[PDB]
Design a protein around this ligand. Structure first.
Ligand SMILES: [Mn+2]
Ligand SMILES: [Mn+2]
Lengths: 122, 131
């Protein structure tokens, strides 16, 4: 059986920029970094966000924006908080349980969700 | 701060066909179907795949293929069995990728909507154990 989630890898054009993004918004915690353009090895980093192993690799950004997305959990008391924090990165946002939708610099639609599965159904 | 992962939402052209895919390969547990009620903004179903809340919505968006992927954990003793289960379903599988020491065995395959999936038999701990 599938023990659970291993990790999630995203491709981005600028690793440095995306990193600040993950650090400013998700408080991502870089734990690994590799790569060497002069040795023809793509650069990539591993971050930890709320216990999840997130890998970022440098490459081409999604050529288009779709509604496929990854959503992280936040308390409903912090919606306004995270909404303003995101509005501050210049990134474009797409204006029960309240949710915040926004893209990174590579067309990856992310969401900050207030509310859980249990609530969702019940 | 972020409490954790809420869910992952994928967009597919054929919900019923994608559902079979998930239930067969990932033993996905369906816990919700917009069909369960009357009047639903869209055709969608929610599944539980190894703790994760996976949501599927029927749509037309068919993003290009990229190395953006989601990887689930498995044991290395199960790599053959999963390769067999995937082969049996006729789903496309990528060749083995080049790896550094401490990466672990992996299986890469797509669904029917350009969603690259991975079954990983390694651990982050073995990948950080080196300089
Ligand atoms: Mn969502
Ligand atoms: Mn991977």
């Amino acid at each position: 059986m599938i023990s659970g989630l291993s990790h999630i890898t995203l491709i981005v054009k600028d690793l440095n920029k995306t990193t600040a993004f993950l650090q400013n918004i998700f408080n991502a915690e870089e734990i690994y970094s590799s790569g060497d353009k002069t040795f023809s090895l793509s650069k990539e980093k591993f971050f930890l966000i709320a216990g999840l192993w997130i890998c970022i690799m440098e490459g081409d950004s999604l050529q288009e924006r779709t509604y496929n997305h990854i959503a992280f959990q936040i308390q409903s008391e912090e919606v306004d908080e995270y909404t303003e924090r995101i509005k501050a990165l210049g990134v474009e946002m797409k204006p029960e349980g309240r949710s915040i939708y926004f893209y990174d610099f590579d067309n990856h639609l992310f969401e900050l969700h207030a509310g859980t599965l249990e609530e969702r159904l019940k």
